Amino acid sequence: AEPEHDHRKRMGLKMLLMMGLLLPLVYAMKRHKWSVLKSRKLAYRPP
Amino acid sequence: ADLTEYLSRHYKAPRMVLAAAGGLEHRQLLDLAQKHFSGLSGTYDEDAVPTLSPCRFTGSQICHREDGLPLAHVAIAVEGPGWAHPDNV
């Protein structure tokens, strides 16, 4: 019924293994670029 | 007192240069320097602390938004090397 069964889970392995590399990395890329906003400071100085 | 202390701290001979340019002669200027300037570092400090620490340069931005002003002023810069570096030329 499911001949692909074994290849799929070998791929599936690779998907979690790769995802476990890329996820943290891409997340870190976004934080880097968003740094500038996250730590920005404001001040109001009206007359 | 803040002023007198800043003065004493800084207006000390070895950090001063008496300069001139024109129809003068070096000896006259040297004579005058000796006549009117001798007696500044007749002291000279023990542990004082006149050293300059290097200054951290930071990649940053300061934006003072004011839409009431008719034109924008903007100034960008990277870190330069300093007076001594030949790269300046």
From Swiss-Prot, chain A:
Residue ranges in the Mitochondrial matrix topological domain are: 39-47
Question: Quick one: signal sequence residues?
Answer: none
Name where it's found.
Mitochondrion inner membrane
The organism's place on the tree of life at top rank: Eukaryota
* Residue stretches spanning the membrane: 5-38
Per the record, the similarity remark reads: Belongs to the cytochrome c family.
Subunit (UniProt): Component of the ubiquinol-cytochrome c oxidoreductase (cytochrome b-c1 complex, complex III, CIII), a multisubunit enzyme composed of 11 subunits. The complex is composed of 3 respiratory subunits cytochrome b, cytochrome c1 and Rieske protein UQCRFS1, 2 core protein subunits UQCRC1/QCR1 and UQCRC2/QCR2, and 6 low-molecular weight protein subunits UQCRH/QCR6, UQCRB/QCR7, UQCRQ/QCR8, UQCR10/QCR9, UQCR11/QCR10 and subunit 9, the cleavage product of Rieske protein UQCRFS1.
Role description: Component of the ubiquinol-cytochrome c oxidoreductase, a multisubunit transmembrane complex that is part of the mitochondrial electron transport chain which drives oxidative phosphorylation.
Please identify the protein, giving its name as recorded. Answer: Cytochrome c1, heme protein, mitochondrial
Organism field: Bos taurus
Q: What is the lineage of its organism?
A: Eukaryota, Metazoa, Chordata, Craniata, Vertebrata
UniProtKB/Swiss-Prot annotation, chain B:
Question: Subcellular localization, per the record?
Answer: Mitochondrion inner membrane
- Cystine pairs annotated here are none
| N6-acetyllysine sites (modified residues) | K35
Function as written in the Swiss-Prot or TrEMBL entry: Component of the ubiquinol-cytochrome c oxidoreductase, a multisubunit transmembrane complex that is part of the mitochondrial electron transport chain which drives oxidative phosphorylation.
Which family, according to UniProt? Belongs to the peptidase M16 family. UQCRC1/QCR1 subfamily.
> What binding partners and quaternary form does the record give?
Component of the ubiquinol-cytochrome c oxidoreductase (cytochrome b-c1 complex, complex III, CIII), a multisubunit enzyme composed of 11 subunits. The complex is composed of 3 respiratory subunits cytochrome b, cytochrome c1 and Rieske protein UQCRFS1, 2 core protein subunits UQCRC1/QCR1 and UQCRC2/QCR2, and 6 low-molecular weight protein subunits UQCRH/QCR6, UQCRB/QCR7, UQCRQ/QCR8, UQCR10/QCR9, UQCR11/QCR10 and subunit 9, the cleavage product of Rieske protein UQCRFS1.
Name the UniProt record assigns to this protein: Cytochrome b-c1 complex subunit 1, mitochondrial
Its ancestry begins with: Eukaryota, Metazoa, Chordata, Craniata, Vertebrata
Gene name linked to the record: UQCRC1
